[PDB]
Write a protein that binds this DNA or RNA. Structure first.
Ligand SMILES: CC[C@H]1OC(=O)/C=C/[C@H](C)[C@@H](O[C@@H]2O[C@H](C)C[C@H](N(C)C)[C@H]2O)[C@@H](C)C[C@@H](C)C(=O)/C=C/C=C/[C@@H]1CO[C@@H]1O[C@H](C)[C@@H](O)[C@@H](OC)[C@H]1OC
Ligand SMILES: [Mg+2]
Ligand SMILES: [Mg+2]
Ligand SMILES: [Mg+2]
Ligand SMILES: [Mg+2]
Ligand SMILES: [Mg+2]
Ligand SMILES: [Mg+2]
Ligand SMILES: [Mg+2]
Ligand SMILES: [Mg+2]
Ligand SMILES: [Mg+2]
Ligand SMILES: [Mg+2]
Ligand SMILES: [Mg+2]
Ligand SMILES: [Mg+2]
Ligand SMILES: [Mg+2]
Ligand SMILES: [Mg+2]
Ligand SMILES: [Mg+2]
Ligand SMILES: [Mg+2]
Ligand SMILES: [Mg+2]
Ligand SMILES: [Mg+2]
Ligand SMILES: [Mg+2]
Ligand SMILES: [Mg+2]
Ligand SMILES: [Mg+2]
Ligand SMILES: [Mg+2]
Ligand SMILES: [Mg+2]
Ligand SMILES: [Mg+2]
Ligand SMILES: [Mg+2]
Ligand SMILES: [Mg+2]
Ligand SMILES: [Mg+2]
Ligand SMILES: [Mg+2]
Ligand SMILES: [Mg+2]
Ligand SMILES: [Mg+2]
Ligand SMILES: [Mg+2]
Ligand SMILES: [Mg+2]
Ligand SMILES: [Mg+2]
Ligand SMILES: [Mg+2]
Ligand SMILES: [Mg+2]
Ligand SMILES: [Mg+2]
Ligand SMILES: [Mg+2]
Ligand SMILES: [Mg+2]
Ligand SMILES: [Mg+2]
Ligand SMILES: [Mg+2]
Ligand SMILES: [Mg+2]
Ligand SMILES: [Mg+2]
Ligand SMILES: [Mg+2]
Ligand SMILES: [Mg+2]
Ligand SMILES: [Mg+2]
Ligand SMILES: [Mg+2]
Ligand SMILES: [Mg+2]
Ligand SMILES: [Mg+2]
Ligand SMILES: [Mg+2]
Ligand SMILES: [Mg+2]
Ligand SMILES: [Mg+2]
Ligand SMILES: [Mg+2]
Ligand SMILES: [Mg+2]
Ligand SMILES: [Mg+2]
Ligand SMILES: [Mg+2]
Ligand SMILES: [Mg+2]
Ligand SMILES: [Mg+2]
Ligand SMILES: [Mg+2]
Ligand SMILES: [Mg+2]
Ligand SMILES: [Mg+2]
Ligand SMILES: [Mg+2]
Ligand SMILES: [Mg+2]
Ligand SMILES: [Mg+2]
Ligand SMILES: [Mg+2]
Ligand SMILES: [Mg+2]
Ligand SMILES: [Mg+2]
Ligand SMILES: [Mg+2]
Ligand SMILES: [Mg+2]
Ligand SMILES: [Mg+2]
Ligand SMILES: [Mg+2]
Ligand SMILES: [Mg+2]
Ligand SMILES: [Mg+2]
Ligand SMILES: [Mg+2]
Ligand SMILES: [Mg+2]
Ligand SMILES: [Mg+2]
Ligand SMILES: [Mg+2]
Ligand SMILES: [Mg+2]
Ligand SMILES: [Mg+2]
Ligand SMILES: [Mg+2]
Ligand SMILES: [Mg+2]
Ligand SMILES: [Mg+2]
Ligand SMILES: [Mg+2]
Ligand SMILES: [Mg+2]
Ligand SMILES: [Mg+2]
Ligand SMILES: [Mg+2]
Ligand SMILES: [Mg+2]
Ligand SMILES: [Mg+2]
Ligand SMILES: [Mg+2]
Ligand SMILES: [Mg+2]
Ligand SMILES: [Mg+2]
Ligand SMILES: [Mg+2]
Ligand SMILES: [Mg+2]
Ligand SMILES: [Mg+2]
Ligand SMILES: [Mg+2]
Ligand SMILES: [Mg+2]
Ligand SMILES: [Mg+2]
Ligand SMILES: [Mg+2]
Ligand SMILES: [Mg+2]
Ligand SMILES: [Mg+2]
Ligand SMILES: [Mg+2]
Ligand SMILES: [Mg+2]
Ligand SMILES: [Mg+2]
Ligand SMILES: [Mg+2]
Ligand SMILES: [Mg+2]
Ligand SMILES: [Mg+2]
Ligand SMILES: [Mg+2]
Ligand SMILES: [Mg+2]
Ligand SMILES: [Mg+2]
Ligand SMILES: [Mg+2]
Ligand SMILES: [Mg+2]
Ligand SMILES: [Mg+2]
Ligand SMILES: [Mg+2]
Ligand SMILES: [Mg+2]
Ligand SMILES: [Mg+2]
Ligand SMILES: [Mg+2]
Ligand SMILES: [Mg+2]
Ligand SMILES: [Mg+2]
Ligand SMILES: [Mg+2]
Ligand SMILES: [Mg+2]
Ligand SMILES: [Mg+2]
Ligand SMILES: [Mg+2]
Ligand SMILES: [Mg+2]
Ligand SMILES: [Mg+2]
Ligand SMILES: [Mg+2]
Ligand SMILES: [Mg+2]
Ligand SMILES: [Mg+2]
Ligand SMILES: [Mg+2]
Ligand SMILES: [Mg+2]
Ligand SMILES: [Mg+2]
Ligand SMILES: [Mg+2]
Ligand SMILES: [Mg+2]
Ligand SMILES: [Mg+2]
Ligand SMILES: [Mg+2]
Ligand SMILES: [Mg+2]
Ligand SMILES: [Mg+2]
Ligand SMILES: [Mg+2]
Ligand SMILES: [Mg+2]
Ligand SMILES: [Mg+2]
Ligand SMILES: [Mg+2]
Length: 72
RNA sequence: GGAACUGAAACAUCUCAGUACCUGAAGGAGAAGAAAGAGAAUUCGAUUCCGUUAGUAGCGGCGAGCGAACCCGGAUCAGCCC
RNA sequence: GUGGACUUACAAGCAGUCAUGGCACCUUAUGCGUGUUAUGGCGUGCCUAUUGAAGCAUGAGCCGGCGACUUAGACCUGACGUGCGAGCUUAAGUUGAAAAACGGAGGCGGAGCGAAAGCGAGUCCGAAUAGGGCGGCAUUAGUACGUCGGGCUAGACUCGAAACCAGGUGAGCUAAGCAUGACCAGGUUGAAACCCCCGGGGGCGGAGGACCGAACCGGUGCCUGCUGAAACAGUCUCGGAUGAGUUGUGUUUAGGAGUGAAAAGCUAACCGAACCUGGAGAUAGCUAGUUCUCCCCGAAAUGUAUUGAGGUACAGCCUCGGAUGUUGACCAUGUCCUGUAGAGCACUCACAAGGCUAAAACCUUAUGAAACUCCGAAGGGGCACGCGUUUAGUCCGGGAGUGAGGCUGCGAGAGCUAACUUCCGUAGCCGAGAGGGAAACAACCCAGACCAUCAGCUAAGGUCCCUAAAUGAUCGCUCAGUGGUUAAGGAUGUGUCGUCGCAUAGACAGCCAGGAGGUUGGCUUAGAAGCAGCCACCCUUCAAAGAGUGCGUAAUAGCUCACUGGUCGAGUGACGAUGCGCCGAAAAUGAUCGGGGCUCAAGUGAUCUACCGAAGCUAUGGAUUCAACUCGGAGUUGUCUGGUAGGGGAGCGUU
RNA sequence: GUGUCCGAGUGUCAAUGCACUAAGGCGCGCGAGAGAACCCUCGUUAAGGAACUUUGCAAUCUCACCCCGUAACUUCGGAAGA
RNA sequence: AGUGGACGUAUAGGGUGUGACGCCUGCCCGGUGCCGGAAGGUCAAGUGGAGCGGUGCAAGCUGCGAAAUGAAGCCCCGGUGAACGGCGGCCUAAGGUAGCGAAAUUCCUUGUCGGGUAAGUUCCGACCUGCACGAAAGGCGUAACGAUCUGGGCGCUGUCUCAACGAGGGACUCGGUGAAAUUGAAUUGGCUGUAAAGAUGCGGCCUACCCGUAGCAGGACGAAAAGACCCCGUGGAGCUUUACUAUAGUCUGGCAUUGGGAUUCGGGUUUCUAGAAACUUGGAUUUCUAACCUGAAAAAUCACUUUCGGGGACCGUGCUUGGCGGGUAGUUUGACUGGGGCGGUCGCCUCCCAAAAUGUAACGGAGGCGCCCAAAGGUCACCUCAAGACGGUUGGAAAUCGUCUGUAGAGCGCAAAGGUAGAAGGUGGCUUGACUGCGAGACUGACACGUCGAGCAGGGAGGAAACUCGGGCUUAGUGAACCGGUGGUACCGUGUGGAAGGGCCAUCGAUCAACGGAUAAAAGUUACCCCGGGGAUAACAGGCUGAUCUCCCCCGAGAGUCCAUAUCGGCGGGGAGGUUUGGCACCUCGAUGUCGGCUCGUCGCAUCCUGGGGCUGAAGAAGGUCCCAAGGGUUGGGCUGUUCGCCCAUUAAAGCGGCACGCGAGCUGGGUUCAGAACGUCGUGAGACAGUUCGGUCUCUAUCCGCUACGGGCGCAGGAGAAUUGAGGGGAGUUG
RNA sequence: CACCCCCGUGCCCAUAGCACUGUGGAACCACCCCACCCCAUGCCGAACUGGGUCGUGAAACACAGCAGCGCCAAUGAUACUCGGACCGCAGGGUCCCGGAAAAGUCGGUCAGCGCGGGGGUU
C-alpha cells in the first residue's frame, strides 16, 4: 500500500448568512449532498454556484433534502 | 601549432579560448592599407585607433551563454609604383 | 629577576562577585578613598558548532605585530541629497592647465497594443461588440550627478583540496640494455671421455645453473632500537657462495612514458601515473574564520518543487519607508456548515445462549467494530454586527535570514499501550530567556531582567538545624523509618462505617460426659467397609447423633468432630466497602529523604491563619523608543526598553 | 654506505677461517661515585622436563677432523654428514 | 624518414597458455571468437539523373530529386576446444572418460570408523551425502629439492611448575653541557547523584597540614595523524566491459601519382549495300617497360652509369567512402531509505488515519488508473430494480412465466466513497452541442497547472412547447518546455519583385512512468585508493527501553500407589535484573583500539565448598529442597585463536555475573579487519563473500589526579633527650 | 371561512405512513364498454390511446373509526466535553465550573394550512 490521493478541499464554500456575487461557488460536493434551491445552478461535478447577487439561505429538512437558495 | 581545469550546479555539441603555452619573423614598433569593398541614399571612397550605435541585430543542447557591422562623432589623414 | 607592603603551612578551590572586618598608604587622594587581606554568601572558562556545551565536542602555549565583505563598468534596481526641470545631460576628444571651458555624435523622459505587417489613444483576439493589456481619470515628472542598500559580470568576504592540462627538468637513486674492464680464500664430491680385467670392478681423468664455507652479494626469525647511533639499522641466526653470478667506468631508454624472472614494483628518501615552472587567486552545494560602541524592532527550522533531501527557487514568518485608515485582535449576539467523543445496531463484517425448522432465512435474549452508522454533543470553522473592551491590520517598494528542531501535556498512527524511539495534530516552554522554586537540572512550577537603593507587598515554593520564615493551632491517621522504589497475591495489622446469623426461654472457643441403627450400605479394581473412587441419599430406635468431617495400614478399629449435657457467664462469628500501613521486594567501588535528625512529629488527611520568600508588583531618583502637547532636537504627561540569524538608527577610535 | 691493489707471524688437515700477537694504528671528545625497584646484553641453576604457549617462538642440546656403520624409497645419480 | 626483429629467413622469428619427468588429457559448435564458403537478404560515396519545383517574355539559370547499377563488411551456411567457455534443476549443445574427494575446494562440521595421546575441533588412513573436484585457467602420481606450511616422535633445555643468585650497560647521587613531543587557563580529592546520557570543576556527604623525591600506569574519554572502516559530496583518480561517444590503428570502394597495347567490348559520332573500316568514354581479364619500387657491380647511406637483374601501372602516398576498432581517450553509472546495500517506492484516483471547518506524516492500514463508449453522447418519449414465499413444461437450492410483499436491501463500463426511486438505472426515435469565437464571476495552488461556470455572437440538434445541449452521474484515464512531421493562412522574408526559409491557427511524435520531466546520445569496479566533510550516520563501548534472555512469585490441573504443594508443576497471570540477540541513534568520525590469552585485581549474591537452620517420601549413612550466611576458598592437563563446550585425572568445591563484554601510554598478537598469493563459489571483465589458506611494523623520556615507598618545612604557647596511651586504619579469616 | 361533499393542484415535507376496517355512487371519480382507422404494444386496447350509455361502488380512490405496527418523543439521570486544577510509573482515572447527548421510560399522532372549480340544503 502506502498509496493515497490528493485532497479535494470540498465543502460548503459559502455558509448561510453570506452575501454572494453571481458565479460564486457555495457548495462543493461529490454529488448532490446539496440540491440547489431558487437562484442557484449546479455544474458538472455537481458544485452549485449562485446566478443572482444576494444573501445565501439554506433550506434544509435534510436526509438528502438540503437545498441552497439565494435571496435578493 | 594549439590546451585543460572551469561554466553548463552531471556531461559529449557549447564554453572556458584562439585564453595559457610552444615555436618563427621583426622593428622602435608592428600589423594593415589605396575597394572585383561597405551598403540601400542611385550615398560612401584607403588603413589603423577612441566614442557611439548596443547588448540593437543575431548566434546558442535557442541552454550556460556568445555578440557584430553600417550611419554618426573624433585622433591622423599622402597615395604612389610595375 | 632583585627589594618592600600585606599575607599564606585542618585547605575542597573556572580563579571571580558583593558584603563585613585587619593592616598599610595619601601627588586626579582623608574619600560614596587606593593597595592588600581574613571570613561569610554567591558563582558550570572562551569561541564555534548546536535540538541541547562547564563540558569528557572543535580551535587555541603566551605577548606582540601582519590577517578577511573590496575594486571595476558610459551596467540594472531602490533610498536619500543637489542642479535644471517637461525637459535633463554628454562620450570620445580639442584648447588650456598653480585653475577648467568648449565639445550634441549619443543616451533617458514624451504612446501604447500586437506574434508582425501595421494601426494609433487607441490596440490584439474575432465574422462586432465578451475580454486582455493601455490612455482618460490620481496628467503621481523627468534627468545629470554624489553618497549609500541591494543585483549583475570578473578571483568578488579570507584561507583550504585530492585532481586536470602545457612546456620543460631529471636514469648522478632505482628499473633494464650496450660497450668495455675487473672480482669470487680455502676444503668436499668425483660425470663423460680414455685405458686394463670379467653393463660390472680397477685406474685415470677433472665435469657440474653440484656440496660446505670466507670475502662479496642477499635479508630468514626473534630481540633491541621506536623525540634512534641510523628518515629502514644493530647483535645474534639465516639464504647463495663458477653462475640465470658480483662489481667499476662510460653510455642509452622517461611521464600515459620508460623499465619490470610481475609487487602496480622502480623511475633522486610519499608513484594505481615523478619533479618544476606555469594555466592559476583552477572549482570547492564542503569546513573553519570575519575584529569599535550604544538605541529600536525581531524571526524560521513550515508548504510545494527539485539527479532534491546538510543545498537552492517561490510562498510562509522579520525589518525599513510610503499610502491607507480601523479594516486588526479577543469577546458577545445571530446564523449557517461538520460526522469526532459518546452511543447504538437500522444497513456491512463479526459475534454470544436457546426456540424454530431440509440448515440461508426467522424470533426472544445478548455484544464489538479505523476503513459500520437509526443517532449524535462539547467544541470548531465562515459570514454579519459591535449593540464592547482593545490596537493592531492591508497593500506597495528596499534588505534579509530561516527551510536540521528539542521537550512536556492532551489526541491519534507506527512500536511491545517499550524507549531521553520514530511520524503527524495541538497548546505552552527551550531554541533566542536572565530571576525564585524543583539538593543538583534548556523543557517542569512560579515569573518576561531600562538603569541605581544597606526600602515595601506578594507568586510558585516554604517556616526543627544546615538555611530566610509559626518546635503554629484543632480533630484525627499510621509505630512501619512507612515517609524516603513497583505488582499479582496473601495477612486474627489497625481505625471508619456497614450487610448476615445465634444469646439474662442463656449461645462462640473453653473442661468432663455420648457418639450411635440396619451398616463389614449399593457402584467399582484383587480387598475399598465416616475415611481411593464414577453414580445416589430416603427410612428405625432418640433429651442425643449427619450411611456423616480431616487424619489412620493396603482394609476395620483408634483420639476428634457436626447435634446432646451438668458446668460456664457475657457477646460473638461471617462475608463485605474503605483510611494508613506489613509481606511480597536480589547487583554489582561506600552509604544516605540534599544532610542532620524527625513518632516527646520535623510524617500524614481536614481546616485556619502569621511570616519568609523573585531581576514579578509597589516607593524615590534617574535615561532612552514612540506618541500626543506646547514654545522657534527642547520641556511636560503617558508609554516602552529579555534577546540568536537579521533589518534599521545615533555615534567613538586610526592613517 | 664507498670501486681497485698490498695485507706478516704462532697454532689449528687447509684457508684471506678462529684465538693470541709484529709492524703500524687506536681507547671511539662528559666525567666521577654508588651498588634500590625496573629495563637491555649475559653466566650458572635443586628436583621435573615442554607441564609453557597460537606454535619448543626463544635458549639449551648437536659442533671440526679420522675409523666403523647407515633404512623406506629411487629418475640408479641420490636420499647421506641418514 | 630511419631502425629493431635481423646482417636472422619456417629445425627461424612473434604471440598466448600450460610448466621437469610418468600415465595421461573424456563429453558438448548451441551462443562468442576465429578459419573457410560466399545461392540469397541488407549496405556508403560514386555512376545515373527519369520526374517534382522555382525565376524569367523567352534562350537559359537554378533547388530538390528517384529506378537500376555501386566494395569490404553484417545476416546466412560448414567447421574449429592445449579458442572464450559449459558439463544441472526433487529441458539446454550437452550433461562428468579416467583419476581424486570432509581437499589449500566440506556449508551442516568437532561427519562416521580406525590410527596416534590419559585426554585429539588439529593431523593421518579409509568411507563417501563432492553446499561448491576434474583433466595443458591441466587431473592423478612422483625420487630430489624448500630460511615453505601442517602433524608427530626422539634429544636437551629456565618456555614453564617458580623463580633464585651473579655479571655488565642504563636507571639512581655530584660536578660540566642540556634538549623534546605537549601545553584554554588552573588554588586540579573520594563516593553517590546530576547534568549532551562516562564530573577534579554542578548537589550533598565523607576525607585531605605546606612542598618534594624514587617509583607504578587506573583516571586526565592522556599524546600523535582535522578516522585509511562507515555514510554524504549531481568530489577525484586507477582498472574493467557486448554502458555512451569519439579515435590512433586497421580493412574497403572511387578519384590523382598513372602509362602504350593487343584481347571480349552493354554503348559514341561522321561514317556505307536491319550495317562496319576510321575509332573509343569507359569496364574486364591478359600482356608490355619509358612512370614508380627494388637489387647486384672499384664508388658501404646517397648520386651516377650500368653488358645490367626482378616486380610493376599493382605496391607505396594524397583526398574522400563505408566497416572493424577498451588499444587509446573523455565521461555517464537517480533518489527515498529509523546507517549503506538488497527488497520495495517514485505520476494520477478512492477510503481510514485526519483529532465533527479546509488542511495534515509515516518503508502506516486497504484498492484501483495509463482506458473506454458512433453510442455507455444531445435531446425527446417511455419502463423500475434486488430478494423472498405460494404455483408451476423437459428445470428444480438458483433457468423462464405467474401472483403477493417489495424508499431500495439492486443497478450505475472498470476501485471505492458520495450520490441516486419524480433517475444518474433500463428501452426506442431522431441528429450531432464529442460546435467555432468569448468569458462575468468564483473555487485551488508558492508558482506553473488545474476545477466549476451564468450569460453574448455566428450557426446548428431534439421537443408542440417551457427548455436542454460547447461530451459521459462525479472524482483516475495523464506529461511544461525545446527540436521536427502534416493542413491551412498570407504576417516577416535583408535593394526591389518573387521564391527558399520563418511566424501564426489546427493537429501529430514522450513507461522523458526517476511521471515539474539535467544530453540528441552512458554500465561497472577499487582492499592500491586519494580529497572534502559527518557523531547530521553504522561497526565497539556507555545511555534510554526491556520484546527476546536470566531470575523469582501466584494459582493449581495432574504426576507423586494413596496424599496437589517431600519433590515436580500443564494451560494461564504477576513482578524483578539488566549479564543475551536486539530497538533506538543521545555524547564521541580534528579517533572512545577492537576478539582471545597473560598480569593484577575488587565488587554483587540469584551461594559450587565451607558454617547455622526448616521440612522431607529424614531409620542410619549418603541426599533432596527451601531459609540465614559473601570470611575465606574454588585444581592441573589434551583439543581449538578461541570464549565457550567436550574429554583426562582430582576435588570440600571445581559458583554465576559486574567493573568500557575490568585491564595493549601493562604484555602478547593466535582471531578478525590494509597491501602478496592460491582454492572453491559469483561475475564475460576489472573484481568479490563476516567462506577458506600461507604471510604480514602494536609508537626509550609521566605534568596533573590516583597508587606504593622515602624525605624537606612548619605546626602542636619554653627549649630539649627518651619512654609511651590508642582515637582511629590495615593484614589475617580456607578446608580434607 | 353560510354549513357539508366531490374533482384537482399546491405548502408541508411519516406527530401525516401501514395494516384491520366501515361509509360512499350515476353528482363527482373509478372499472366495465367497443376498435379498420388517430395513437401504441421490442407479444397483449394491460399501458398509453380514440369512440360511450347502461352496469357497478366490486376493485382503485375519497372520507371517518382505529394506538396492533410503525413515526415522534420529554422530564430525570447519566456518557462525553470547553475552560480551570489534580493523581496514578502505567494502562488509566478524579475534582471544581459550565455546555451536554444517544439509547430507554413518561407521553404524543393515525395530521396540519391554502387556491381555483363542480355539484348539494332550491
Ligand atoms: C614510532 C614507531 C612507529 O609507530 C607506529 O607505526 C605507530 C602508529 C600508530 C599506532 C598509528 O595510530 C593508530 O592508527 C589507528 C588506525 C587508530 C589508532 N587509535 C587511536 C584508534 C591510532 O593509534 C599511526 C598511524 C598514527 C601516527 C602517529 C602515525 O602515522 C605514525 C607514524 C610513525 C610512527 C612510527 C614510525 O616508525 C617508522 O618505522 C620504520 C621501520 C623506522 O625505520 C622509521 O622510519 C624512518 C620510523 O619512522 C617513520
Ligand atoms: Mg505497508
Ligand atoms: Mg560543471
Ligand atoms: Mg570537463
Ligand atoms: Mg600567448
Ligand atoms: Mg614569441
Ligand atoms: Mg629575431
Ligand atoms: Mg590555619
Ligand atoms: Mg589543594
Ligand atoms: Mg555558563
Ligand atoms: Mg548532536
Ligand atoms: Mg574542549
Ligand atoms: Mg588539543
Ligand atoms: Mg566600451
Ligand atoms: Mg530622486
Ligand atoms: Mg484599467
Ligand atoms: Mg544613482
Ligand atoms: Mg543593507
Ligand atoms: Mg538584489
Ligand atoms: Mg583556493
Ligand atoms: Mg652451486
Ligand atoms: Mg645433498
Ligand atoms: Mg632484492
Ligand atoms: Mg642450509
Ligand atoms: Mg604533471
Ligand atoms: Mg597506455
Ligand atoms: Mg622512491
Ligand atoms: Mg582558469
Ligand atoms: Mg534542505
Ligand atoms: Mg523568497
Ligand atoms: Mg480586513
Ligand atoms: Mg473586528
Ligand atoms: Mg466509539
Ligand atoms: Mg477539527
Ligand atoms: Mg455596521
Ligand atoms: Mg520586500
Ligand atoms: Mg526539515
Ligand atoms: Mg515537528
Ligand atoms: Mg502497536
Ligand atoms: Mg525524540
Ligand atoms: Mg531523531
Ligand atoms: Mg538554533
Ligand atoms: Mg520565548
Ligand atoms: Mg528560568
Ligand atoms: Mg530535582
Ligand atoms: Mg539552588
Ligand atoms: Mg544546557
Ligand atoms: Mg539557558
Ligand atoms: Mg532535559
Ligand atoms: Mg504550582
Ligand atoms: Mg513578604
Ligand atoms: Mg502562599
Ligand atoms: Mg532560621
Ligand atoms: Mg495491592
Ligand atoms: Mg506541633
Ligand atoms: Mg503576610
Ligand atoms: Mg524582592
Ligand atoms: Mg524592573
Ligand atoms: Mg528625571
Ligand atoms: Mg524587546
Ligand atoms: Mg523587559
Ligand atoms: Mg535589546
Ligand atoms: Mg697474503
Ligand atoms: Mg695470516
Ligand atoms: Mg696458520
Ligand atoms: Mg679474523
Ligand atoms: Mg686513519
Ligand atoms: Mg682517547
Ligand atoms: Mg643475553
Ligand atoms: Mg634447572
Ligand atoms: Mg629426558
Ligand atoms: Mg596451557
Ligand atoms: Mg611446535
Ligand atoms: Mg604461525
Ligand atoms: Mg629456535
Ligand atoms: Mg627396492
Ligand atoms: Mg645407493
Ligand atoms: Mg654424521
Ligand atoms: Mg599456470
Ligand atoms: Mg576431520
Ligand atoms: Mg585439512
Ligand atoms: Mg591439487
Ligand atoms: Mg579420533
Ligand atoms: Mg584426510
Ligand atoms: Mg583445462
Ligand atoms: Mg599446476
Ligand atoms: Mg631433503
Ligand atoms: Mg630458494
Ligand atoms: Mg616439529
Ligand atoms: Mg641480582
Ligand atoms: Mg648489577
Ligand atoms: Mg648533572
Ligand atoms: Mg663547559
Ligand atoms: Mg541521573
Ligand atoms: Mg541527564
Ligand atoms: Mg566533588
Ligand atoms: Mg567552582
Ligand atoms: Mg612508563
Ligand atoms: Mg575527516
Ligand atoms: Mg577524510
Ligand atoms: Mg566520477
Ligand atoms: Mg583513421
Ligand atoms: Mg566515415
Ligand atoms: Mg575507458
Ligand atoms: Mg543515497
Ligand atoms: Mg478534516
Ligand atoms: Mg509536517
Ligand atoms: Mg436520463
Ligand atoms: Mg452555457
Ligand atoms: Mg445558441
Ligand atoms: Mg421544430
Ligand atoms: Mg505548412
Ligand atoms: Mg531532454
Ligand atoms: Mg519530481
Ligand atoms: Mg600501492
Ligand atoms: Mg565536526
Ligand atoms: Mg548522533
Ligand atoms: Mg553500539
Ligand atoms: Mg555486536
Ligand atoms: Mg580530541
Ligand atoms: Mg587521542
Ligand atoms: Mg541470600
Ligand atoms: Mg550444609
Ligand atoms: Mg543421614
Ligand atoms: Mg567470591
Ligand atoms: Mg568476576
Ligand atoms: Mg555488553
Ligand atoms: Mg574487553
Ligand atoms: Mg594475528
Ligand atoms: Mg568463470
Ligand atoms: Mg592455521
Ligand atoms: Mg624500549
Ligand atoms: Mg634507553
Ligand atoms: Mg591548640
Ligand atoms: Mg584501635
Ligand atoms: Mg585519617
Ligand atoms: Mg435531563
Ligand atoms: Mg467554564
Ligand atoms: Mg479540558
Ligand atoms: Mg458536568
Amino acid at each position: 500500500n502506502g498509496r493515497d490521493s490528493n485532497p479535494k478541499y470540498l465543502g460548503v464554500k459559502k455558509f448561510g448568512g453570506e452575501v454572494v456575487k453571481a458565479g460564486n461557488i457555495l457548495v462543493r460536493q461529490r454529488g448532490t449532498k446539496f440540491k440547489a434551491g431558487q437562484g442557484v445552478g449546479m455544474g458538472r461535478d455537481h458544485t452549485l454556484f449562485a446566478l443572482s447577487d444576494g444573501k445565501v439561505v439554506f433550506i434544509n429538512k435534510g436526509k438528502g433534502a438540503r437545498f441552497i437558495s439565494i435571496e435578493a
